[PDB]
RNA sequence: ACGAGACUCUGGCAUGCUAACUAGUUACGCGACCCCGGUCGGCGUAACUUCUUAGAGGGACAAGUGGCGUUCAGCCACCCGAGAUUGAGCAAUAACAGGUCUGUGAUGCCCUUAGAUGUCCGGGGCUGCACGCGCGCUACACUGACUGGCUCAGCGUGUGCCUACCCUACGCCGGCAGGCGCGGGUAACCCGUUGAACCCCAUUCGUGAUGGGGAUCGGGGAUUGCAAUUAUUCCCCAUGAACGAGGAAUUCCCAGUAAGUGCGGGUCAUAAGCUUGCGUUGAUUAAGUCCCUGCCCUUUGUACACACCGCCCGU
């Protein structure tokens, strides 16, 4: 029964950026919730990073909504 | 041209039911196959008319609970559609097959009845009717996703998505499988 | 930082455990085994007492530990069925003494771990394996083979340094055993 | 225990009156499919139809009354 | 940009209070006693500072301009009906107070009522409700 | 013979009947915009009741089929079918020491009647708080909060006798609460096609007593009234408490139902956290039982009959 009060970073440090750029385009389902859970960052910060990766073109859009968005990796072939 | 009742973008055919005891109670195949999980009504009027309802419609109707969500059918429908999106993009498997195999795997097949006076603890082992199997299975899936998506950063479109696949493979990391097999354990403990 | 007490992940059948109760449910009740890393357990309503009860919290007492016996376990799935009715009155003092030795060993090793600054799950399991589980497997007693080993090693440094864990960490553990276990 | 009873599935033939303290149980007349000659009575919870096949964890007990 | 900038000030020491830098600038300045959500948008609209940045990366000149808007809001064309303290009984001026003038002026008003012996002052001295509501069924945390 | 039933009102349909410039539809002309064709709740007038209004008649009766039943009363499932159990109204003999003398110029008796228990004026009180109890409202959040845009109803009511106090389109001023000259309706004509809320879409927020929650409290400005202080009410900026899904116990309900959500009426000079109606979205479970709390009939028992909340024995 450990509490472990989360203290999410408001912006990226050095290790989070390349950890994201090497592991997030190698995952099956990408949503800001699972990005905030795995990378211990804020929800809006994950949304901004995912918008940057969408503008870069390494993530394809699946469906957009005001509640949550759905993202997936590129085909490895 | 109505070649196939595509459930938005998923095909209602080529889905396999593994249990024969739930064959006539789950209607998804070739007759009760709709484009939406929202129909008109007059489905809970007589005794067994709810067995003819589509299973995704029953899941959508049982999705809404706890006061502030009653009547919001559109919101539960779009949760169901987004959950089907993560289910299709997550395993590579057709999302209607995942719904069917989870309900079979999460159905409690034996029950204990409270017997005696008020306060005494006596249980008698009975078996569960196949309609009530589907009914408590849908209720268990809905309450597992509901208590997963509470005071958490993870959305309900993802909390519902992880809850069925853990019930589909029988990994027992889901909450429906947890109450299913403790109920089977209680029914087995005193027969 | 926390882990299991003994080397076994899940206990065997017909074994006594001391468990912390958490909440009361309809079919059973949710508890937490403090010596098995707070895993989920179940106590039955009819198994709480052999006679007629008047209220649920006559024997619930949420927050205070109790003694139970494992009736049926499932190692592959992680389910333990507990029993309250099948306990002897003479077992309580021995269970309390065993939990006292286990908790003072866990507190001493936690103190040595935060002195040595080794904060990792696998590294902490390695420290337990090199500190207590080795002498537990050597003396063939799950709990009774450890406290006697620290009691001997408080006076015998040659018996203390038999495990090849480290040098400075071994000195810190010997200092903790000398200061605490007197 | 130490014995895995194989699960047998049985289909009803006739529904009887509803038993139980609150009338929540029901007496049914089920029949086996590996040999269609045997008919026993079981206690079921929930609504049942005619021709509704049920799963049985055990196939050895007999139905008791409301008590 | 999204990478943390250099000299990213975490804890902001402004007006002898503690201010977090991880919160939005339209909401991190609301932790100061006396200023709230509505008046915060006007201040960052008079100053040429966007609302899309956190409070932890702003620097001395912009936070100094915001502190000038705090202390003297009248001649930066903030409307007179937007203020919390208007038409004073001591001197008759329109001003915005930031926790020090606010706390000491509320204390001075309460001792003014207690000295003038109005029933509002007597109810504040006794520790009861002043706006004229029922006390029979509520207020059970008054005294033991 | 009464009661139940029978009877009435409302909902559910009828492209058949009667009818509509205080309701529209379809065609025709004119006008406006665009690329030859679309939109107009823009303007005007040749048929019509498909929408609407409301009158008369019709339609569902266990009527048919297959079973169960003494094959008698009736029950079950199915087909054709808008419905094969819609909801309300009225509601018998007998009595309650049930409530109302504060509904009445309905009322017996008693008290009082000029230093009045009649009446009137002015002020206060019915709101006063160690505490306990009941009906309710808002929330404890991410099935969410804020901000923009999109978009859909039905019951109603409205210038009153002494009695003065109505509902409101439109123009300007002001952040807003609000203010002035202007027009309609004594009402299917005017508010009004009642651009309602919940929902839908798109940003901001990210598990933090937090942008949740708005209690408490300070300052200022308008409206009603002869008069607001013990803030009538409304508006603006600050103040941001408890509350992390609630112990023993207990209430209501089974189909357009519970629940969420808003709109009318009653009180009303100023006026809804209450109540009565209305509409939108819209489920989980069950077609059974007498175990609990009670009710109806028959038999039996009784030392009860102001009737078990009864009666009664002894220190």
UniProtKB/Swiss-Prot annotation, chain A:
Chief location category: cytoplasm
Keyword Manganese: no
Gene Ontology CC, one term: postsynaptic density
Modified residues (N6-acetyllysine): 5, 14, 22, 28, 56
Example GO BP: rRNA processing
Residues with PTM N6-succinyllysine: 14, 56
GO MF annotation, one: structural constituent of ribosome
Domain of life: Eukaryota
Compartments it resides in: Cytoplasm
Assigned keywords, A-Z: Acetylation, Cytoplasm, Ribonucleoprotein, Ribosomal protein
Role this protein plays: Component of the small ribosomal subunit. The ribosome is a large ribonucleoprotein complex responsible for the synthesis of proteins in the cell.
Family per similarity comment: Belongs to the eukaryotic ribosomal protein eS25 family.
Subunit: Component of the small ribosomal subunit.
Full protein name: Small ribosomal subunit protein eS25
Residues of the full protein shown: 38 to 114 of 124
From Swiss-Prot, chain B:
Protein name: Small ribosomal subunit protein uS7
Protein location: Cytoplasm; Nucleus, Nucleolus
Modification N6-acetyllysine, positions: 34
Major location (coarse): cytoplasm
Covalent crosslink: Glycyl lysine isopeptide (Lys-Gly) (interchain with G-Cter in SUMO2): 34
Positions carrying Phosphoserine: 129
Source species, domain of life: Eukaryota
Subunit-structure text: Component of the small ribosomal subunit. Part of the small subunit (SSU) processome, composed of more than 70 proteins and the RNA chaperone small nucleolar RNA (snoRNA) U3.
Keyword annotations: Acetylation, Cytoplasm, Isopeptide bond, Nucleus, Phosphoprotein, Ribonucleoprotein, Ribosomal protein, Ubl conjugation
InterPro entries xref list: Ribosomal_uS7, Ribosomal_uS7_CS, Ribosomal_uS7_dom, Ribosomal_uS7_dom_sf, Ribosomal_uS7_euk/arc
Protein family membership: Belongs to the universal ribosomal protein uS7 family.
Gene Ontology process terms (BP): translation
PANTHER family: RIBOSOMAL PROTEIN S7
Organism: Oryctolagus cuniculus
GO cellular component: cytosolic ribosome; nucleolus; small ribosomal subunit
Function: Component of the small ribosomal subunit. The ribosome is a large ribonucleoprotein complex responsible for the synthesis of proteins in the cell. Part of the small subunit (SSU) processome, first precursor of the small eukaryotic ribosomal subunit. During the assembly of the SSU processome in the nucleolus, many ribosome biogenesis factors, an RNA chaperone and ribosomal proteins associate with the nascent pre-rRNA and work in concert to generate RNA folding, modifications, rearrangements and cleavage as well as targeted degradation of pre-ribosomal RNA by the RNA exosome.
Positions of post-translational Phosphothreonine modification: 1
A UniProt-annotated Pfam family: Ribosomal_S7
From Swiss-Prot, chain D:
Pfam families: Ribosomal_S28e
Classification via InterPro entries: NA-bd_OB-fold (IPR012340), Ribosomal_eS28 (IPR000289), Ribosomal_eS28_CS (IPR028626)
UniProt keyword annotation of Ribonucleoprotein present: yes
Any single GO CC term annotated in Swiss-Prot or TrEMBL for this entry: cytosolic ribosome
Modified residues (Phosphoserine): 39
Presence of the UniProt keyword Transmembrane helix in the record: no
Subcellular locations according to the entry: Cytoplasm, Cytosol; Cytoplasm; Rough endoplasmic reticulum; Nucleus, Nucleolus
HAMAP family linked: Ribosomal_eS28
Top-level taxon: Eukaryota
UniProt protein name: Small ribosomal subunit protein eS28
Swiss-Prot record, chain E:
N-acetylserine carried by residues: 1
Function: Component of the small ribosomal subunit. The ribosome is a large ribonucleoprotein complex responsible for the synthesis of proteins in the cell.
Pfam families xref list: Ribosomal_S13
Keyword flag Ribosomal protein: yes
Subunit structure: Component of the small ribosomal subunit.
Cited InterPro entries: Rbsml_uS13_C, Ribosomal_uS13, Ribosomal_uS13-like_H2TH, Ribosomal_uS13_CS
Alphabetical UniProt keywords: Acetylation, Cytoplasm, Isopeptide bond, Ribonucleoprotein, Ribosomal protein, RNA-binding, rRNA-binding, Ubl conjugation
Protein name: Small ribosomal subunit protein uS13
Alphabetized HAMAP family for the sequence: Ribosomal_uS13 (MF_01315)
One example GO MF annotation: structural constituent of ribosome
Modified residues (N6-acetyllysine): 93, 105
Family statement drawn from the similarity comment of this UniProt entry: Belongs to the universal ribosomal protein uS13 family.
Gene Ontology terms describing biological process: translation
One GO CC term, this protein: cytosolic ribosome
Localization terms from the record: Cytoplasm
Source organism superkingdom: Eukaryota
